[model samples]
Target chain A: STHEPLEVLKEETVNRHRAIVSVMAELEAVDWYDQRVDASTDPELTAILAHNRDEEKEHAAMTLEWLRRNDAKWAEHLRTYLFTEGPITA
Target chain B: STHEPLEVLKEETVNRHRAIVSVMAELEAVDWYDQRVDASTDPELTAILAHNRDEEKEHAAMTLEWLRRNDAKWAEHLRTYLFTEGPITA
Candidate 1:
């Protein structure tokens, strides 16, 4: 029998990471639609982009809540790593 | 060609399973809301239950559409297994 690491939070962390990446990709799609599709001319695409942007924000919030509940330090670290530009040293 | 089984639909099946489980969990939450929440006066709790129920149904439909597009047979099998009580005798 193969031995597996008994990391209960490992799968949860991976799921959170996947959610982050998925929402990021969705946000990128919203940006693409905003840039490429004219809102005035393409009503359907405009609505799609609007819906996607709102959902992306909601998804981010849900993932953040999950992270905070499971491991606050790791969640904070991930949020900083994914969104921040550089280390802010005083 | 590589001697791998090349089960292209395996990932799709796994994703579909995840979606089903997620939707089932949402359904359970709605049931809990119905049982535990005093929604006669609590408008907010009622609204939450309604919203979650609608979303759970939408998720199920979305997964069904995806499965239909990917592989009809696998989708049928999944629907039968998950939704049906038992095999029907002819």
Candidate 2:
């Protein structure tokens, strides 16, 4: 909103943008928590960070699912690659 | 570390796990900074957050380039759709 006018952007574009931004936040949180989990001296702190890490990833994945449903291109690539067993480039 | 055994994991797996984890963290940071950039009331603060957000994405993209080299599957998909102009599913 601060960067651009909502009135200027299309509805679909705005929604997708929001999804993309949210996914980025959730994923980054997972990483920050991941680093902390490794750096922590206490098991309790490690465990808490680890839990937050997992929760963040779950959130990212859920957002991914939403993107797959909303964006055809993403859906295509995800369908092609996700949960498939084989050589990656195969 | 807390969820799985590094001792049991392969060396290649360890490096890859680290890369994946790092990439996820960078990506998540990009999103968080993105949100803050939008929610800001001050231009200077917004500029700072926006700088952080862009830098985080550049970091994510660089990590992505690394992944493209390391992970054959992601390499394949990125090869297909990243700069392509055709239908994503096509």
Best by DockQ: 2
Give interface RMSD, per candidate. 16.7, 8.9
TM-score of 2: 0.53
lDDT of 1: 0.61
Error of 1 at A60 (Å): 2.2
lDDT of 2 by residue, B1-90 (tens): 424455544455456556666756765565556556666679999899877765554555455455456655445545544433434445
Among residues 3 or more apart in sequence or in different chains, the pairs in candidate 1 whose N, CA or C atoms overlap within 3 Å are: none
Model 1 scores a TM of 0.35
TM-score of chain A of each: 0.47, 0.89
Query: Which ten contiguous residues of candidate 2 chain A have the minimum total lDDT?
Result: A1-10
Clashing pairs in 2: A25-B31, A27-B28, A28-B28, A28-B29
Question: Considering every candidate listed, which one attains the maximal lDDT?
Answer: 1
Candidate 2 deviant stretches above 4 angstroms: A1-4, B1-90
DockQ-based CAPRI category assigned to the predicted complex of candidate 2: incorrect
Q: What is the lDDT of residue A50 in candidate 1?
A: 61
lDDT of 1 by residue, B1-82 (tens): 2111236347765666666576577667657756655545777877877676667666766766676667778667666655
